[PDB]
């Protein structure tokens, strides 16, 4: 029983390509949900104006020019 030449590296119900297709579908679920989130456009539906800080949006306290 001579040993194999590649005798140094040695989910049975699925194949590599079929399981890759399943993984691609699973990740396409995330991609489609992201596209739906883009389509929702939640940015234009914000219920409050952007917060405005005093002293010119705290320019001096944030490192701005004195």
């Amino acid at each position: 029983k001579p040993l194999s030449v590649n005798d140094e590296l040695m989910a049975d119900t699925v194949g590599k390509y079929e399981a890759l297709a399943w993984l691609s579908g699973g990740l396409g679920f995330f991609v489609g949900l992201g596209l739906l989130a883009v389509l929702n456009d939640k940015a234009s539906k914000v219920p409050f104006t952007p917060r405005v800080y005093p002293y010119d949006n705290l320019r001096v306290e944030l490192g701005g020019e004195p």
Partner: protein, 93 residues
């Protein structure tokens, strides 16, 4: 038998060296190389001292470090442009 204390180096450009034809007087060339290395190390240590100043300004001030350490941060970043053998920004010494 070297004298006790820190090393002493003459801080002056070696006379006889001309940038027009550097490969003219070999001794002035090596002296100039050593001298230039010495001032580049001086610049490096000055940048390190400024870095220490910024380091202890960030910790002592705290939240107010944006307005109190602005003066030091810009000095340190101005002094780190011409450090030496670093990024492609090389000083014209």
């Amino acid at each position: 038998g070297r004298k006790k204390g820190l090393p002493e180096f003459e801080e002056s450009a070696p006379d006889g060296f001309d940038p027009e034809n550097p490969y003219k007087d070999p001794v002035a060339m090596v002296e100039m190389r050593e001298h230039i290395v010495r001032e580049k190390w001086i610049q490096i240590e000055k940048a390190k001292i400024l870095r220490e100043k910024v380091k202890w300004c960030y910790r002592v001030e705290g939240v107010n470090h944006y307005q109190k350490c602005r003066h030091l941060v810009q000095q340190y970043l101005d002094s780190t442009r011409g450090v030496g053998w670093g990024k492609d920004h090389r000083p014209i010494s």
